[PDB]
Amino acid sequence: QLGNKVAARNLAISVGVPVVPATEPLAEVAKMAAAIGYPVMLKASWGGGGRGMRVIRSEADLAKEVTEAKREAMAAFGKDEVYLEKLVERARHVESQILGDTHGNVVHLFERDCSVQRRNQKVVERAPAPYLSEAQRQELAAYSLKIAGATNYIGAGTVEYLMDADTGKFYFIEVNPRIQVEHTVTEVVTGIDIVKAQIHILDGAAIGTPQSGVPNQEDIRLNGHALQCRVTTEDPEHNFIPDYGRITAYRSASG
Amino acid sequence: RAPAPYLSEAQRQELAAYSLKIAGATNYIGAGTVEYLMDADTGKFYFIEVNPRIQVEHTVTEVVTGIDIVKAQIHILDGAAIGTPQSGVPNQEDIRLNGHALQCRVTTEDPEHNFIPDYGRITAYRSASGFGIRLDGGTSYSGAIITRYYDPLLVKVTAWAPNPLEAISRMDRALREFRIRGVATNLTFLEAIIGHPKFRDNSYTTRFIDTTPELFQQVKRQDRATKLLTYLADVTVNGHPEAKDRPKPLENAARPVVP
Ligand SMILES: Nc1ncnc2c1ncn2[C@@H]1O[C@H](COP(=O)(O)OP(=O)(O)O)[C@@H](O)[C@H]1O
Ligand SMILES: [Mg+2]
Ligand SMILES: [Mg+2]
């Protein structure tokens, strides 16, 4: 339901959560793309690895590009389904963290900003999204609970959205039905162990009880701010090519 | 530990009110601690002494209240006012407890030799992090040489969780995840304290360590890898007595393959 992006998007349309205008799956794209309008972002349905995407600015580009986009999606993801989505030209990436149990309770652990991106891959993530109003933040929290309730969501997953910088509108983009690399920032500002929750949950536990590791929605409270960086061997002075071999000395910093 | 988890909210408020009166009646500037004894029989608290400074244990109060104590010290001596966003500190009313913490200090004090600190080269050093774990180290690292002249301290470990039992097992997980080689540590002794029933159910007095032992104390270590390497080196250099003067298998013949 959430694996395929079109099916996921259709899910959200069905429970009243906003989306960007997107086509059906794709040898005559526009007509179709032309109904959406340019510019558009081409996205692999299924497989969403922080990118097999492509911005198409005009019809003359379409033929080479969709084809290429397809050979790649088959390459990287192995399923080959692409659809066109209307491009949000100026965008912030915000996302809701949700926990659902085997008994139908679902809670949000507020949002993260992950707009710090390198060609659509997440680089720096922050909790809460610093530039949000208390009401926008409640607006998002409520969509993600409608998305989770809808799929009787069991465990941890993430609901991701594009904020349109020009209007401050939200548009559901995808679900990740899994823990994420950036979960950690949500953990330190809420005090809630997401992994222990995962396990308590499939043990059959009820969210809101001590043995679930998860508070009732009303006792889930934001405390400060946090951000996460990933240290890699990608060498800034050598085209970010990943270095490797032996680490001979290593001292990380705490406190 | 922080908070002290055996206290009633009446005893905490009672304790905290005495402290603002020892402090106000000296116009104390900076950070300071007011120590009390508590008779476990009556639950009655006795003033004992004041330390006019940050203590080794400030980190637990930091993680449980989210107030940087060092930064408060500097801000305060810059002239800032308690309450101001630009002091370190919120108003009393906005000062709040959040879950639980305990600190253990990892050292070279040897349990297996009466707690004399060990000294020498640290050949391996890995420490453990993750959610709810704070470390205050910087002195140790592989290669480092522990001298006999100062403090035996290697690193201070602070573990946070929403309740005290979960904090104990967070500490227990991080402690046991530590690998320190080249020198002796107090890790086993730290692990025994925190795995103790009297610790888990908060019924220890100050006489607990000097009393419990229950030697604890001991059990050794297998050190199997080193043993195997010893064997391989021995047979590699000297040969095996059953094989060394007898015919030899045809050189690099195939390992057997399990069908
Ligand atoms: N329709 C769009 N318009 C503008 N930018 C987009 C659009 N769709 C995706 N992006 C950018 O690509 C990123 C990844 O999108 P997402 O659907 O989560 O793909 P993935 O499955 O690779 O995570 C988003 O954070 C956003 O920055
Ligand atoms: Mg994504
Ligand atoms: Mg004293």
PDB file of C-alpha atoms in Angstrom, chain A:
ATOM      1  CA  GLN A   1       0.000   0.000   0.000  1.00  0.00           C
ATOM      2  CA  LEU A   2       2.893   2.282   0.870  1.00  0.00           C
ATOM      3  CA  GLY A   3       5.664   0.621  -1.202  1.00  0.00           C
ATOM      4  CA  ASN A   4       4.446   1.917  -4.536  1.00  0.00           C
ATOM      5  CA  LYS A   5       4.370   5.750  -4.548  1.00  0.00           C
ATOM      6  CA  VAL A   6       1.176   6.099  -6.778  1.00  0.00           C
ATOM      7  CA  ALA A   7      -0.758   3.732  -4.611  1.00  0.00           C
ATOM      8  CA  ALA A   8       0.542   5.595  -1.591  1.00  0.00           C
ATOM      9  CA  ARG A   9      -0.319   8.942  -3.093  1.00  0.00           C
ATOM     10  CA  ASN A  10      -3.820   7.559  -3.990  1.00  0.00           C
ATOM     11  CA  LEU A  11      -4.161   6.437  -0.427  1.00  0.00           C
ATOM     12  CA  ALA A  12      -3.568   9.966   0.841  1.00  0.00           C
ATOM     13  CA  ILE A  13      -5.966  11.484  -1.753  1.00  0.00           C
ATOM     14  CA  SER A  14      -8.570   9.061  -0.353  1.00  0.00           C
ATOM     15  CA  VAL A  15      -8.280  10.296   3.242  1.00  0.00           C
ATOM     16  CA  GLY A  16      -8.164  14.049   2.441  1.00  0.00           C
ATOM     17  CA  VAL A  17      -4.414  14.760   2.767  1.00  0.00           C
ATOM     18  CA  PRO A  18      -3.061  17.179   0.137  1.00  0.00           C
ATOM     19  CA  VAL A  19      -0.818  16.131  -2.749  1.00  0.00           C
ATOM     20  CA  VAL A  20       0.980  17.684  -5.714  1.00  0.00           C
ATOM     21  CA  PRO A  21      -0.700  17.065  -9.103  1.00  0.00           C
ATOM     22  CA  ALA A  22       0.752  13.785 -10.349  1.00  0.00           C
ATOM     23  CA  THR A  23       0.045  11.720 -13.411  1.00  0.00           C
ATOM     24  CA  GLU A  24      -0.821   7.943 -13.508  1.00  0.00           C
ATOM     25  CA  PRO A  25       2.073   5.576 -14.332  1.00  0.00           C
ATOM     26  CA  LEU A  26       3.814   5.763 -17.705  1.00  0.00           C
ATOM     27  CA  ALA A  27       4.464   5.330 -25.487  1.00  0.00           C
ATOM     28  CA  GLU A  28       2.701   8.714 -25.023  1.00  0.00           C
ATOM     29  CA  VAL A  29       3.529  10.602 -21.860  1.00  0.00           C
ATOM     30  CA  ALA A  30       2.212  14.173 -22.516  1.00  0.00           C
ATOM     31  CA  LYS A  31      -0.546  13.904 -23.495  1.00  0.00           C
ATOM     32  CA  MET A  32      -0.516  13.254 -19.706  1.00  0.00           C
ATOM     33  CA  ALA A  33       2.489  15.359 -18.754  1.00  0.00           C
ATOM     34  CA  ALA A  34       0.822  18.146 -20.799  1.00  0.00           C
ATOM     35  CA  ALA A  35      -2.290  17.744 -18.554  1.00  0.00           C
ATOM     36  CA  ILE A  36      -0.060  18.227 -15.450  1.00  0.00           C
ATOM     37  CA  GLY A  37       1.975  21.094 -17.019  1.00  0.00           C
ATOM     38  CA  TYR A  38       5.752  21.691 -17.100  1.00  0.00           C
ATOM     39  CA  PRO A  39       8.088  21.650 -15.170  1.00  0.00           C
ATOM     40  CA  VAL A  40       7.677  18.184 -13.720  1.00  0.00           C
ATOM     41  CA  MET A  41       9.709  15.763 -11.609  1.00  0.00           C
ATOM     42  CA  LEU A  42       9.943  12.173 -12.855  1.00  0.00           C
ATOM     43  CA  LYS A  43       9.835   9.671  -9.952  1.00  0.00           C
ATOM     44  CA  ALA A  44      10.315   5.887  -9.752  1.00  0.00           C
ATOM     45  CA  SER A  45       7.229   4.330  -8.178  1.00  0.00           C
ATOM     46  CA  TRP A  46       8.379   1.800  -5.633  1.00  0.00           C
ATOM     47  CA  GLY A  47      12.162   2.148  -5.113  1.00  0.00           C
ATOM     48  CA  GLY A  48      12.855   5.488  -3.462  1.00  0.00           C
ATOM     49  CA  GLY A  49      16.493   5.501  -2.445  1.00  0.00           C
ATOM     50  CA  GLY A  50      16.907   9.209  -1.853  1.00  0.00           C
ATOM     51  CA  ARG A  51      16.892   9.241  -5.686  1.00  0.00           C
ATOM     52  CA  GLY A  52      16.313   7.776  -9.046  1.00  0.00           C
ATOM     53  CA  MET A  53      14.605  11.090 -10.092  1.00  0.00           C
ATOM     54  CA  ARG A  54      14.761  13.629 -12.892  1.00  0.00           C
ATOM     55  CA  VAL A  55      13.520  17.113 -13.581  1.00  0.00           C
ATOM     56  CA  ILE A  56      11.968  17.417 -17.095  1.00  0.00           C
ATOM     57  CA  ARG A  57      11.587  21.057 -18.187  1.00  0.00           C
ATOM     58  CA  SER A  58       9.941  20.581 -21.627  1.00  0.00           C
ATOM     59  CA  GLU A  59       8.299  18.131 -24.092  1.00  0.00           C
ATOM     60  CA  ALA A  60      11.303  18.097 -26.420  1.00  0.00           C
ATOM     61  CA  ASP A  61      13.242  16.482 -23.518  1.00  0.00           C
ATOM     62  CA  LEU A  62      10.594  13.739 -22.697  1.00  0.00           C
ATOM     63  CA  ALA A  63      11.567  10.829 -25.071  1.00  0.00           C
ATOM     64  CA  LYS A  64      15.250  10.582 -24.050  1.00  0.00           C
ATOM     65  CA  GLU A  65      14.945  10.982 -20.247  1.00  0.00           C
ATOM     66  CA  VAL A  66      11.879   8.913 -19.437  1.00  0.00           C
ATOM     67  CA  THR A  67      13.569   6.025 -21.250  1.00  0.00           C
ATOM     68  CA  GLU A  68      16.823   6.777 -19.424  1.00  0.00           C
ATOM     69  CA  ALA A  69      14.880   7.219 -16.211  1.00  0.00           C
ATOM     70  CA  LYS A  70      13.477   3.715 -16.820  1.00  0.00           C
ATOM     71  CA  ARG A  71      16.718   1.825 -17.639  1.00  0.00           C
ATOM     72  CA  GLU A  72      17.932   3.329 -14.249  1.00  0.00           C
ATOM     73  CA  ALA A  73      14.884   2.492 -12.108  1.00  0.00           C
ATOM     74  CA  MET A  74      15.194  -1.085 -13.462  1.00  0.00           C
ATOM     75  CA  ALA A  75      18.905  -0.897 -12.734  1.00  0.00           C
ATOM     76  CA  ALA A  76      18.696   0.455  -9.195  1.00  0.00           C
ATOM     77  CA  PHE A  77      15.221  -0.657  -7.992  1.00  0.00           C
ATOM     78  CA  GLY A  78      14.301  -3.483 -10.437  1.00  0.00           C
ATOM     79  CA  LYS A  79      10.596  -2.674 -10.955  1.00  0.00           C
ATOM     80  CA  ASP A  80      10.756   0.164 -13.664  1.00  0.00           C
ATOM     81  CA  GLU A  81       7.450   2.046 -12.880  1.00  0.00           C
ATOM     82  CA  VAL A  82       7.695   5.799 -13.336  1.00  0.00           C
ATOM     83  CA  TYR A  83       5.154   8.635 -12.956  1.00  0.00           C
ATOM     84  CA  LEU A  84       5.382  12.417 -13.478  1.00  0.00           C
ATOM     85  CA  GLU A  85       4.832  14.703 -10.511  1.00  0.00           C
ATOM     86  CA  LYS A  86       4.439  18.492 -10.657  1.00  0.00           C
ATOM     87  CA  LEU A  87       7.666  20.182  -9.595  1.00  0.00           C
ATOM     88  CA  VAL A  88       7.635  22.332  -6.442  1.00  0.00           C
ATOM     89  CA  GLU A  89      10.223  24.886  -7.509  1.00  0.00           C
ATOM     90  CA  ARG A  90      10.976  26.265  -4.051  1.00  0.00           C
ATOM     91  CA  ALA A  91      10.609  23.523  -1.465  1.00  0.00           C
ATOM     92  CA  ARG A  92      11.262  22.593   2.163  1.00  0.00           C
ATOM     93  CA  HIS A  93      11.200  18.856   3.153  1.00  0.00           C
ATOM     94  CA  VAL A  94       9.295  18.163   6.358  1.00  0.00           C
ATOM     95  CA  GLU A  95       8.258  14.786   7.700  1.00  0.00           C
ATOM     96  CA  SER A  96       6.140  13.245  10.464  1.00  0.00           C
ATOM     97  CA  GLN A  97       7.288  10.389  12.712  1.00  0.00           C
ATOM     98  CA  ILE A  98       4.434   7.979  13.639  1.00  0.00           C
ATOM     99  CA  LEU A  99       4.162   4.901  15.845  1.00  0.00           C
ATOM    100  CA  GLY A 100       1.230   2.405  15.395  1.00  0.00           C
ATOM    101  CA  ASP A 101       0.434  -0.672  17.580  1.00  0.00           C
ATOM    102  CA  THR A 102      -1.291  -4.042  16.982  1.00  0.00           C
ATOM    103  CA  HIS A 103      -4.455  -2.565  18.706  1.00  0.00           C
ATOM    104  CA  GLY A 104      -5.114   0.401  16.474  1.00  0.00           C
ATOM    105  CA  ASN A 105      -3.523   3.249  18.420  1.00  0.00           C
ATOM    106  CA  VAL A 106      -1.277   5.530  16.498  1.00  0.00           C
ATOM    107  CA  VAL A 107       0.767   8.527  17.757  1.00  0.00           C
ATOM    108  CA  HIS A 108       2.968  11.172  16.169  1.00  0.00           C
ATOM    109  CA  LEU A 109       6.386  12.205  17.513  1.00  0.00           C
ATOM    110  CA  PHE A 110       6.259  15.568  15.695  1.00  0.00           C
ATOM    111  CA  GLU A 111       8.239  16.517  12.558  1.00  0.00           C
ATOM    112  CA  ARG A 112      11.738  16.846  11.079  1.00  0.00           C
ATOM    113  CA  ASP A 113      13.192  19.231   8.593  1.00  0.00           C
ATOM    114  CA  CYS A 114      15.340  17.411   6.030  1.00  0.00           C
ATOM    115  CA  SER A 115      15.589  20.171   3.393  1.00  0.00           C
ATOM    116  CA  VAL A 116      19.417  20.062   3.588  1.00  0.00           C
ATOM    117  CA  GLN A 117      19.872  17.871   0.497  1.00  0.00           C
ATOM    118  CA  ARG A 118      22.327  16.944  -2.180  1.00  0.00           C
ATOM    119  CA  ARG A 119      20.386  16.080  -5.399  1.00  0.00           C
ATOM    120  CA  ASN A 120      17.369  14.919  -3.373  1.00  0.00           C
ATOM    121  CA  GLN A 121      19.329  12.815  -0.843  1.00  0.00           C
ATOM    122  CA  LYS A 122      19.153  13.887   2.801  1.00  0.00           C
ATOM    123  CA  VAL A 123      22.248  15.479   4.275  1.00  0.00           C
ATOM    124  CA  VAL A 124      21.355  17.343   7.458  1.00  0.00           C
ATOM    125  CA  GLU A 125      18.130  16.660   9.366  1.00  0.00           C
ATOM    126  CA  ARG A 126      16.638  18.596  12.344  1.00  0.00           C
ATOM    127  CA  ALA A 127      13.866  18.174  14.970  1.00  0.00           C
ATOM    128  CA  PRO A 128      11.523  19.960  15.304  1.00  0.00           C
ATOM    129  CA  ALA A 129      11.428  21.690  11.866  1.00  0.00           C
ATOM    130  CA  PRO A 130      12.670  25.041  13.138  1.00  0.00           C
ATOM    131  CA  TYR A 131      10.640  27.365  10.820  1.00  0.00           C
ATOM    132  CA  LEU A 132       7.146  25.916  11.619  1.00  0.00           C
ATOM    133  CA  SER A 133       4.206  27.558  13.459  1.00  0.00           C
ATOM    134  CA  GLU A 134       2.462  25.655  16.264  1.00  0.00           C
ATOM    135  CA  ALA A 135      -0.582  25.282  13.908  1.00  0.00           C
ATOM    136  CA  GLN A 136       1.319  24.059  10.806  1.00  0.00           C
ATOM    137  CA  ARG A 137       2.929  21.517  13.105  1.00  0.00           C
ATOM    138  CA  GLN A 138      -0.502  20.396  14.381  1.00  0.00           C
ATOM    139  CA  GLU A 139      -1.699  20.425  10.664  1.00  0.00           C
ATOM    140  CA  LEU A 140       1.043  17.902   9.670  1.00  0.00           C
ATOM    141  CA  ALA A 141       0.632  15.788  12.810  1.00  0.00           C
ATOM    142  CA  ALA A 142      -3.053  15.363  11.926  1.00  0.00           C
ATOM    143  CA  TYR A 143      -2.473  14.279   8.311  1.00  0.00           C
ATOM    144  CA  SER A 144       0.045  11.662   9.323  1.00  0.00           C
ATOM    145  CA  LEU A 145      -2.408  10.170  11.771  1.00  0.00           C
ATOM    146  CA  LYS A 146      -5.057   9.990   9.082  1.00  0.00           C
ATOM    147  CA  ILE A 147      -2.422   8.289   6.844  1.00  0.00           C
ATOM    148  CA  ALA A 148      -1.422   5.788   9.602  1.00  0.00           C
ATOM    149  CA  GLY A 149      -4.942   4.989  10.861  1.00  0.00           C
ATOM    150  CA  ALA A 150      -5.799   4.243   7.192  1.00  0.00           C
ATOM    151  CA  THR A 151      -3.285   1.466   6.785  1.00  0.00           C
ATOM    152  CA  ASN A 152      -3.644   0.259  10.380  1.00  0.00           C
ATOM    153  CA  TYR A 153      -0.009   1.038  10.596  1.00  0.00           C
ATOM    154  CA  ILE A 154       2.012  -1.422  12.658  1.00  0.00           C
ATOM    155  CA  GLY A 155       5.354  -0.119  14.084  1.00  0.00           C
ATOM    156  CA  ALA A 156       7.478   2.931  13.143  1.00  0.00           C
ATOM    157  CA  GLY A 157       7.194   4.673   9.774  1.00  0.00           C
ATOM    158  CA  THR A 158       7.617   8.166   8.358  1.00  0.00           C
ATOM    159  CA  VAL A 159       5.287  10.441   6.370  1.00  0.00           C
ATOM    160  CA  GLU A 160       7.149  12.904   4.176  1.00  0.00           C
ATOM    161  CA  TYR A 161       5.910  16.213   2.756  1.00  0.00           C
ATOM    162  CA  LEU A 162       6.968  19.142   0.593  1.00  0.00           C
ATOM    163  CA  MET A 163       6.338  22.586   1.991  1.00  0.00           C
ATOM    164  CA  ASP A 164       5.919  25.079  -0.819  1.00  0.00           C
ATOM    165  CA  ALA A 165       8.002  28.088   0.241  1.00  0.00           C
ATOM    166  CA  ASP A 166       5.800  30.414  -1.858  1.00  0.00           C
ATOM    167  CA  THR A 167       2.501  29.485  -0.129  1.00  0.00           C
ATOM    168  CA  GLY A 168       3.385  27.500   3.014  1.00  0.00           C
ATOM    169  CA  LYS A 169       1.194  24.650   1.650  1.00  0.00           C
ATOM    170  CA  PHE A 170       2.078  21.011   2.408  1.00  0.00           C
ATOM    171  CA  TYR A 171       1.917  18.226  -0.104  1.00  0.00           C
ATOM    172  CA  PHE A 172       2.260  14.630   0.959  1.00  0.00           C
ATOM    173  CA  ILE A 173       5.082  13.085  -1.123  1.00  0.00           C
ATOM    174  CA  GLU A 174       5.760   9.550   0.295  1.00  0.00           C
ATOM    175  CA  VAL A 175       5.754   7.115   3.269  1.00  0.00           C
ATOM    176  CA  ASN A 176       8.780   5.283   4.506  1.00  0.00           C
ATOM    177  CA  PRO A 177       7.309   2.193   6.243  1.00  0.00           C
ATOM    178  CA  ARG A 178      10.445   1.706   8.338  1.00  0.00           C
ATOM    179  CA  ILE A 179      12.758   3.458  10.743  1.00  0.00           C
ATOM    180  CA  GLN A 180      14.963   6.187   9.141  1.00  0.00           C
ATOM    181  CA  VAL A 181      18.590   7.262   9.455  1.00  0.00           C
ATOM    182  CA  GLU A 182      17.383  10.608  10.931  1.00  0.00           C
ATOM    183  CA  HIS A 183      15.130   9.056  13.656  1.00  0.00           C
ATOM    184  CA  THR A 184      17.820   9.981  16.239  1.00  0.00           C
ATOM    185  CA  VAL A 185      17.038  13.726  16.270  1.00  0.00           C
ATOM    186  CA  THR A 186      13.390  12.904  17.038  1.00  0.00           C
ATOM    187  CA  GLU A 187      14.565  10.684  19.897  1.00  0.00           C
ATOM    188  CA  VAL A 188      16.568  13.296  21.776  1.00  0.00           C
ATOM    189  CA  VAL A 189      13.953  16.044  21.596  1.00  0.00           C
ATOM    190  CA  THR A 190      10.999  13.757  22.628  1.00  0.00           C
ATOM    191  CA  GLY A 191      12.789  11.335  25.045  1.00  0.00           C
ATOM    192  CA  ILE A 192      11.224   8.303  23.327  1.00  0.00           C
ATOM    193  CA  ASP A 193      13.241   5.334  22.171  1.00  0.00           C
ATOM    194  CA  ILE A 194      11.837   4.506  18.755  1.00  0.00           C
ATOM    195  CA  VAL A 195      13.667   1.172  18.448  1.00  0.00           C
ATOM    196  CA  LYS A 196      12.525  -0.114  21.894  1.00  0.00           C
ATOM    197  CA  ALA A 197       9.068   1.025  20.843  1.00  0.00           C
ATOM    198  CA  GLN A 198       9.375  -1.038  17.674  1.00  0.00           C
ATOM    199  CA  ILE A 199      10.085  -4.130  19.698  1.00  0.00           C
ATOM    200  CA  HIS A 200       7.557  -3.499  22.473  1.00  0.00           C
ATOM    201  CA  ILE A 201       4.968  -2.971  19.690  1.00  0.00           C
ATOM    202  CA  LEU A 202       5.461  -6.349  17.907  1.00  0.00           C
ATOM    203  CA  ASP A 203       5.545  -7.945  21.328  1.00  0.00           C
ATOM    204  CA  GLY A 204       1.848  -6.979  21.215  1.00  0.00           C
ATOM    205  CA  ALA A 205       2.061  -3.931  23.532  1.00  0.00           C
ATOM    206  CA  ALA A 206      -0.374  -0.971  23.846  1.00  0.00           C
ATOM    207  CA  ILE A 207       0.986   2.510  23.118  1.00  0.00           C
ATOM    208  CA  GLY A 208       0.370   4.582  26.226  1.00  0.00           C
ATOM    209  CA  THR A 209       1.277   1.810  28.659  1.00  0.00           C
ATOM    210  CA  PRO A 210       4.707   1.653  30.441  1.00  0.00           C
ATOM    211  CA  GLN A 211       5.545  -1.716  28.759  1.00  0.00           C
ATOM    212  CA  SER A 212       5.108  -0.173  25.284  1.00  0.00           C
ATOM    213  CA  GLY A 213       7.861   2.371  25.954  1.00  0.00           C
ATOM    214  CA  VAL A 214       5.456   4.948  24.436  1.00  0.00           C
ATOM    215  CA  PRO A 215       3.452   7.725  26.120  1.00  0.00           C
ATOM    216  CA  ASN A 216      -0.126   8.597  25.275  1.00  0.00           C
ATOM    217  CA  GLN A 217      -0.290  11.311  22.649  1.00  0.00           C
ATOM    218  CA  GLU A 218      -0.891  14.028  25.267  1.00  0.00           C
ATOM    219  CA  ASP A 219       2.329  13.252  27.176  1.00  0.00           C
ATOM    220  CA  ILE A 220       4.516  13.350  24.080  1.00  0.00           C
ATOM    221  CA  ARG A 221       6.403  16.686  24.564  1.00  0.00           C
ATOM    222  CA  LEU A 222       8.984  18.564  22.536  1.00  0.00           C
ATOM    223  CA  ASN A 223      12.164  19.398  24.417  1.00  0.00           C
ATOM    224  CA  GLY A 224      14.654  21.643  22.718  1.00  0.00           C
ATOM    225  CA  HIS A 225      16.169  21.218  19.278  1.00  0.00           C
ATOM    226  CA  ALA A 226      18.557  18.831  17.584  1.00  0.00           C
ATOM    227  CA  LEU A 227      20.367  18.177  14.363  1.00  0.00           C
ATOM    228  CA  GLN A 228      22.267  15.275  12.858  1.00  0.00           C
ATOM    229  CA  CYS A 229      25.308  15.114  10.638  1.00  0.00           C
ATOM    230  CA  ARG A 230      26.874  12.086   9.070  1.00  0.00           C
ATOM    231  CA  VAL A 231      30.660  11.781   9.055  1.00  0.00           C
ATOM    232  CA  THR A 232      31.829   9.874   5.945  1.00  0.00           C
ATOM    233  CA  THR A 233      35.098   9.108   4.137  1.00  0.00           C
ATOM    234  CA  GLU A 234      33.937  11.229   1.161  1.00  0.00           C
ATOM    235  CA  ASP A 235      36.951  13.477   0.548  1.00  0.00           C
ATOM    236  CA  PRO A 236      36.048  17.212  -0.036  1.00  0.00           C
ATOM    237  CA  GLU A 237      39.569  17.861  -1.540  1.00  0.00           C
ATOM    238  CA  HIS A 238      39.161  14.881  -3.963  1.00  0.00           C
ATOM    239  CA  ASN A 239      35.711  15.216  -5.650  1.00  0.00           C
ATOM    240  CA  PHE A 240      34.100  13.620  -2.501  1.00  0.00           C
ATOM    241  CA  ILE A 241      35.448  10.281  -3.571  1.00  0.00           C
ATOM    242  CA  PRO A 242      35.103   7.875  -0.518  1.00  0.00           C
ATOM    243  CA  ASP A 243      38.525   7.219   1.060  1.00  0.00           C
ATOM    244  CA  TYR A 244      39.211   3.819   2.591  1.00  0.00           C
ATOM    245  CA  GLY A 245      42.003   1.677   4.180  1.00  0.00           C
ATOM    246  CA  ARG A 246      43.049   1.690   7.849  1.00  0.00           C
ATOM    247  CA  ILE A 247      41.992   4.306  10.443  1.00  0.00           C
ATOM    248  CA  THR A 248      45.221   4.478  12.544  1.00  0.00           C
ATOM    249  CA  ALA A 249      43.922   6.964  15.055  1.00  0.00           C
ATOM    250  CA  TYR A 250      40.438   7.944  15.912  1.00  0.00           C
ATOM    251  CA  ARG A 251      39.092  10.297  18.536  1.00  0.00           C
ATOM    252  CA  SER A 252      35.464  11.382  18.444  1.00  0.00           C
ATOM    253  CA  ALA A 253      34.044  14.110  20.624  1.00  0.00           C
ATOM    254  CA  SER A 254      31.445  13.783  23.388  1.00  0.00           C
ATOM    255  CA  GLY A 255      29.992  15.869  26.278  1.00  0.00           C
TER     256      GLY A 255
END
